[PDB]
Amino acid sequence: IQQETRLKVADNSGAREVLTIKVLGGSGRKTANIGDVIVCTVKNATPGGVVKKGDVVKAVIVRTKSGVRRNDGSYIKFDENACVIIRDDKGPRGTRIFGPVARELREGNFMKIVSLAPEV
Amino acid sequence: TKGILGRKIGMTQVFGENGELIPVTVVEAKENVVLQKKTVEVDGYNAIQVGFEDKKAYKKDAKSNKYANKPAEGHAKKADAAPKRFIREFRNVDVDAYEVGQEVSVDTFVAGDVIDVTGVSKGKGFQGAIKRHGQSRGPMSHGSHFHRAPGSVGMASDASRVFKGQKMPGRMGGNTVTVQNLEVVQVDTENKVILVKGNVPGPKKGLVEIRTSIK
Amino acid sequence: AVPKRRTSKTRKNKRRTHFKISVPGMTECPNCGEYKLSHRVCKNCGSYNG
Amino acid sequence: GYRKLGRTSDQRKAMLRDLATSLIISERIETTEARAKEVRSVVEKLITLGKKGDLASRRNAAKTLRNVEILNEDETTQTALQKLFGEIAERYTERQGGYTRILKQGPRRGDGAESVIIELV
Amino acid sequence: NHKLIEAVTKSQLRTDLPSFRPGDTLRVHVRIIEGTRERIQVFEGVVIKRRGGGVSETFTVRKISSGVGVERTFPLHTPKIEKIEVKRRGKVRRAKLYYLRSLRGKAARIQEI
RNA sequence: UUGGCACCUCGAUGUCGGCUCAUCGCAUCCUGGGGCUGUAGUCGGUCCCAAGGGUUGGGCUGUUCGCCCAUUAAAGCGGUACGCGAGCUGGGUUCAGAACGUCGUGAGACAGUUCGGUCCCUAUCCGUCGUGGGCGUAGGAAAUUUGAGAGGAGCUGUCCUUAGUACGAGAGGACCGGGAUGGACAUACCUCUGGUGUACCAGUUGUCGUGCCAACGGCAUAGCUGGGUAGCUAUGUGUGGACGGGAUAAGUGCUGAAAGCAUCUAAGCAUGAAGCCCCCCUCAAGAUGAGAUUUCCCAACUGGUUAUAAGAUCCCUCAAAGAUGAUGAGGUUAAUAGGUUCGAGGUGGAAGCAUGGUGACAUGUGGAGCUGACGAAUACUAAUCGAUCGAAGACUUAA
């Protein structure tokens, strides 16, 4: 969200917490929102998962404590930020997803996430 | 169509047809009248004066501008209309309005006329460089004594003077500002009100003039 | 800062053009007869009658 | 509030409670024009409460009014509340608001600050 | 409250939806215009706040889905909230239930009226 | 740049690197237009014209430089006292302390290295940014304006389509067009999401008070904590850089000879850039070249004077305005502010009483009671009475 924000990876990909490095899209952009691809490095992990700590990967912002406006005066505000570690295609790297995800992620091509998400 | 004059009531929100919430500004435009019709007999530029709000008739006490003085009353009788406040002048209209004063009804604006608004912006009294020009304020902790002053105000001793258009503290707001490419949400007759997508300049109770966008 | 050069007594009197003070804005009392200060109570004799 | 009186919130509120009590004790006082423009709006609402009369209307009066006793009742000792609910209220029970009036006197010496005589109508 | 603002914007006000109180448990039947069709994805949970007045009256529902609490803000008079059904009337002793945004378990319970 | 000189300054012109604020050049990093390729296409190379706008965030290091991580259309090179300390810092270098290595017999010194170490000034003139007064603009005014000029803006990616088309064995993959949608940045506003909200509501602790209980008040950052109205605000909500005409640069030419030919040039005729001039937005008639248009006032006495007219103020109530003045809204024939009666929104169920508990308490009476700035009505209070300023229209010449 901010290039120092510690996100909770809600994806079963070995990584647990990640630190934001750069918010892709724009020369000098400084804020990402739900459905925005961020470059981040893994700070914590689970023993025996493909994403080992100390590596730079890509993720998408799935939850946020500030939320989205949804174009018709309807606000959604999750309780804690979270990201899914993702590949160079708009598709997840893991196999499970934990917790809610936002519907404005479907406008992008993250249909595999919402397919895997437990609810939207 | 006929750019009219109005009074800024407030802001509200409406719901579209796909239910999209829409911020809207409410303007009242009652008692528009055309007071005079320029031609090339007068400076060579077609135009029409319209007066928006009416004053009282002539009086002898007459010490608060609510009572039309004699010159304005003459001018407003020469079109056969009550003395108006807020006389303004519209170009970019064909002279098909009458030199007489017919009511300039809001009904000329028809449900999706891209219109732009002009008004005097809200007044901020004597703001500083940060507020007035959005400059970056210096640090505040590490032994710093520079917080909100302007930066340096020129080069040292080559020019030896301060150029014009320097950004220094002074009086803010108040200027005439114009917002372009706004939309007409609805036109409510029986109140002479118009609803505009967004937010026009100036405070509430402030004069605003509407026009059809030149772009 | 310090004045680089003393102020000529012409520039002093030019700057002091607007330093004049204005009249008090007074009227004649319709009861006292003497002068009062408009919208104030007559110091000399009695009421305000407003 | 409308206008800060060159004081702080507790200090200004004490100022206004004192002025209001003194006004309804003396029924006319000479003060400064801004203090009067504020004591005006305070004592207006106090006498509205007095005109109401109910007990809650008495305990609300009893928080924005001081505790002085009026010795000069000719051996009687009214509190300010007893004064305000008997005499002031029964007096002004007809008119619908506007219970005082301010009269400018002129510039006080030592400030040049205008002096006013705020009194009960 | 300006009579002209109201006179304009008082057809937008829905008329049949019930009146709850901030602390009641609601079920909102929202609509979903994405895809090529609508559904009615009920959002349950406690009423954290009602706010404002007029056409601009919003409320907030809060539900803890799976270890994660989601809050949704809805304007009252949106035509998308098809209906609102009140399960159980809670007792809150205040207007804004913001302390519930930091409670997590059996501490975020509300009584019944 | 490293220098060379020693011309100004030793009765004093403050160093480097950052910050705030910029500004200018072009020897152009990006975007724009072209030529030539050893240019099949996507991408290049190298030249030419072009300065409109743009040209990132971090790690390390006092550092500039520099190396690296990650994006970017691009992460340009330079001047401005190596721009800017009466705008900021004091981290390095060059004040006193102390120590290491080392040179010195020694006091002590560095090729060095390390820990610590007072950064004063109320702006007179010019300059700059905002704002009033005077007079002028051949009568005295109110209002609306034109525009000579001057300032502002000017950026850009990505996805879909044409079209897997052209081009290529393949792999790959288009010009020129349309469309949608972002980044950054400008500007307007407060309906929404939020922040603030010290004369709003509620809870709660210690202590002193109103004689006691109950209910309140004072003090303790506003005692603290939970909310929040108007206003002010961004991180919130809208809008912007549209579409185009004219003259052009490098280039592309047509016609065309001097020079039977050819030849873009000599005469002539076009085309041709994010650039110039308009178009967009803003100030603008002190534009002394002081412009215009409409309406108002225009007598009485002696070359002329006078006051009064239209109108404007003084004084007063104010706020959408404000440092003050000015700007607007009003001054009783009156809704300008206060009060009053209604609401709006905010809080969250007042006091008293009845009931249940033995008691802390709970319930009903009752979405109650309170409520600063928001909307409306109401002359209850105060804008009283008065006073000042303000014209009688020069001179020629032609009609």
Mapping DSSP onto H, E and C, the string for E57-80 reads CEEEEEEECCCCEEEEEEECCCCC
Q: Provide the token pair at B22.
A: 């829409």
CB A77 within 8 A of CB A67: yes
Task: State the pairing for strand pair E84-86/A82-86.
Answer: unpaired
Touching chains D and A? (3+ Cβ pairs < 8 A): no
Q: Provide the token pair at E73.
A: 């803000």
CB B63 within 8 A of CB B54: no
Q: How far apart are the first and last CA of chain B?
A: 14
Q: How far apart are CA D40 and CA D16, in angstroms?
A: 10
DSSP of C1-50? ---SSPPPHHHHHHHTTTT------EEE-TTT-SEEETTS--SSSS----
Touching chains E and C? (3+ Cβ pairs < 8 A): no
Q: How far apart are CA D61 and CA D82, in angstroms?
A: 11
CB B209 within 8 A of CB B3: yes
For C39, C42, D108, D116, the CA distances from D37, given in Å and listed in that order, are 16, 21, 17, 10
CA/C1' separation C5–F126 (Å): 13
Helix (H) or strand (E) holding D42: helix D33-52
Q: How many other CB atoms sit within 10 Å of the CB of residue B127? A: 14
Phi, psi (degrees; rounded to nearest 5) at D107: -75, 115
What's the maximum distance between 2 C-alpha atoms anywhere in chain D?
A: 45
CB A11 within 8 A of CB A91: no
Using only C-alpha atoms, what is the Rg of chain C?
Answer: 21
Q: How far apart are CA A33 and CA B109, in angstroms?
A: 39
CB B50 within 8 A of CB B99: no
- Buried-state track B136-150, b at ≥16 Cβ within 10 A, e below 16: eeeeeeeeeeeeeeb
Helix (H) or strand (E) holding B25: strand B21-28
Give strand F nucleotides closer than 7 A to any protein Cβ.
19-23, 54-57, 69-75, 80-81, 83-90, 121-132, 141-147, 151-152, 182-194, 198-199, 210, 215-220, 222-223, 226-228, 231-233, 236-242, 279-283, 291-297, 310-323, 328-333, 338-341, 343-352, 367, 369-376, 378, 380-387
CB E48 within 8 A of CB E101: yes
DSSP of B60-113? SS--SSSB--HHHHHHHHTTT-PPEEEEEEE-SS-TTS-SS--B--GGGS-SS-
CB B182 within 8 A of CB B119: no
Q: How far apart are CA A73 and CA E75, in angstroms?
A: 7
For B38, E59, E97, E112, the CA distances from E46, given in Å and listed in that order, are 65, 11, 9, 12
Nearest CA among E13, E33, E12, E22 for reference residue E80: E33
Q: How far apart are CA E88 and CA E109, in angstroms?
A: 12
Task: State the pairing for strand pair B115-120/B207-212.
Answer: antiparallel
For residue A33, the domain's CATH number is 2.40.150.20
A120: exposed, middle or buried (Cβ count in 10 Å: 0-12, 13-18, 19+): middle
Phi, psi (degrees; rounded to nearest 5) at A57: -135, 180
CB E70 within 8 A of CB E62: yes
**Nucleotide nearest to B75 in CA–C1' terms:** F295
Min Cα separation E105/chain A (Å): 14
B19 closest CB neighbour out of E9, E54, E78: E78
Residue A73, CB-side half-sphere exposure with 13 Å CA sphere: 24
Instruction: Print the domain residue range for A41.
Output: 1-120
Q: Three-state SS across E14-63?
A: CCCCCCCCCCCEEEEECCCCCCCCCCCCEEEEEEEEEECCCCCCEEEEEE
Nearest CA among B192, B201, B199, B207 for reference residue B87: B207
If one counts the domains in chain C, the total is: 1
Min Cα separation B99/chain E (Å): 31
Contact B12 E2 (CB under 8 A): no
Does the CB of B151 sit below 7 A from strand F? yes
* Residue recorded with tokens 């295609």: A89
Interface check B19 vs A, CB under 8 A: yes
Q: Provide the token pair at A92.
A: 């997840």
Give the angle subtended at the CA of D108 by the CAs of D105 and D114, to the nearest 5°: 55
Q: How far apart are CA A32 and CA A83, in angstroms?
A: 11
Q: How far apart are CA A23 and CA C50, in angstroms?
A: 73
Q: How far apart are CA D12 and CA D18, in angstroms?
A: 10
Which chain B residues in 24-53 sit with Cβ < 7 A of strand F? 36, 38, 42-43, 45, 47, 49
Give the residue from chain A lying closest to B21, CA to CA. Answer: A72
Instruction: Print the domain residue range for D25.
Output: 1-121
Contacts of A19 (CB under 8 A, 6+ apart): A4, A5, A6, A7, A40, A41, A43
Q: How far apart are CA A81 and CA A86, in angstroms?
A: 16
3-state secondary structure of B14: strand
Would the annotation count B160 as a binding residue? no
3-state secondary structure of B176: strand
Q: Provide the token pair at D63.
A: 């928080």
Q: How far apart are CA B154 and CA B160, in angstroms?
A: 8
Backbone break loci in chain A, preceding residues, C–N > 2.5 A: none
Interface check D117 vs C, CB under 8 A: yes
Q: Provide the token pair at B54.
A: 């009416």
Min Cα separation A100/chain E (Å): 7
Instruction: Print the domain residue range for C33.
Output: 2-50
Helices (H), A10-65: none
- Buried-state track B62-83, b at ≥16 Cβ within 10 A, e below 16: eeeeebbeeebbebbeebebbb
* Residue recorded with tokens 């109140």: B191
* Residue recorded with tokens 């934990």: A98
Q: How far apart are CA C7 and CA C20, in angstroms?
A: 20
CB B195 within 8 A of CB B9: no
Q: Tell me the chain E residues in contact with residue A63 when contact means C-beta distances shorter than 8 Å.
A: 68
The alpha carbon of A89 is separated from its chain's Cα centroid by a whole number of angstroms, namely 14
Task: State the pairing for strand pair A6-9/A82-86.
Answer: parallel
For A54, B197, E72, the CA distances from A68, given in Å and listed in that order, are 31, 21, 10
**Nucleotide nearest to A36 in CA–C1' terms:** F182
Min Cα separation A34/chain B (Å): 20
For residue D40, the domain's CATH number is 3.90.1030.10
CA/C1' separation B166–F2 (Å): 39
Q: How far apart are the first and last CA of chain E?
A: 33
Q: Provide the token pair at E64.
A: 């803890």
Helix (H) or strand (E) holding A62: strand A56-63
CA/C1' separation A82–F260 (Å): 87
Cited resolution, angstroms: 3.1
Min Cα separation A27/chain E (Å): 32
Q: Tell me the chain D residues in contact with residue C37 when contact means C-beta distances shorter than 8 Å.
A: 106
Chains that touch E (3 or more CB pairs under 8 A): A, B
If one counts the domains in chain D, the total is: 1
Touching chains A and B? (3+ Cβ pairs < 8 A): yes
C37 closest CB neighbour out of D103, D106, D117: D106
Q: What is the phi-psi region of residue B126: left when phi exceeds 0, alpha when psi lies from -120 to 50, beta otherwise? A: left
CB D14 within 8 A of CB D42: no
* Residue recorded with tokens 């018709």: A72
Nearest CA among E69, B1, E19 for reference residue A76: E69
Helix (H) or strand (E) holding D35: helix D33-52
CB B48 within 8 A of CB E44: no
Q: Provide the token pair at E30.
A: 């929202």
3-state secondary structure of B174: coil
Closest CA to the C1' of F314: that residue is C25
Using only C-alpha atoms, what is the Rg of chain B?
Answer: 23
CB D20 within 8 A of CB D65: yes
* Dihedral angle sign, alpha carbons of residues E10, E15, E21, E27: negative
Does the CB of E54 sit below 7 A from strand F? yes
CB A40 within 8 A of CB A20: yes
Q: How far apart are CA B143 and CA B149, in angstroms?
A: 16
Q: How many other CB atoms sit within 10 Å of the CB of residue A97? A: 22
Q: How far apart are CA A6 and CA B91, in angstroms?
A: 58
Using only C-alpha atoms, what is the Rg of chain A?
Answer: 13
Does the CB of B139 sit below 7 A from strand F? yes
Q: How far apart are CA B106 and CA A37, in angstroms?
A: 48
Does the CB of D94 sit below 7 A from strand F? no
Among C27, C40, C42, C44, most D C-beta atoms within 10 A, so best to mutate, is: C40
Edge-to-edge strand list for the sheet holding B207-212? B176-182, B115-120, B207-212, B5-15, B21-28, B193-197, B184-188
3-state secondary structure of B136: coil
Q: Tell me the chain B residues in contact with residue E5 when contact means C-beta distances shorter than 8 Å.
A: 9-10, 12, 26
Q: How many other CB atoms sit within 10 Å of the CB of residue E107? A: 9
Phi, psi (degrees; rounded to nearest 5) at E64: -95, 110
Helix axes D33-52, D9-26, angle to 10 degrees: 70
* Residue recorded with tokens 């040292």: B156
Helix (H) or strand (E) holding A22: strand A17-23
Q: How far apart are CA B21 and CA A74, in angstroms?
A: 9
Q: Provide the token pair at D74.
A: 């000719």
DSSP of D55-96? HHHHHHHTTSS---EE-TTTS--EEHHHHIIIIIHHHTSSS-
Q: How far apart are the first and last CA of chain A?
A: 21
Does the CB of C39 sit below 7 A from strand F? yes
Helix (H) or strand (E) holding A21: strand A17-23
Residue B71, CB-side half-sphere exposure with 13 Å CA sphere: 1
* Dihedral angle sign, alpha carbons of residues A34, A35, A40, A46: positive
Q: How far apart are CA D70 and CA D34, in angstroms?
A: 27
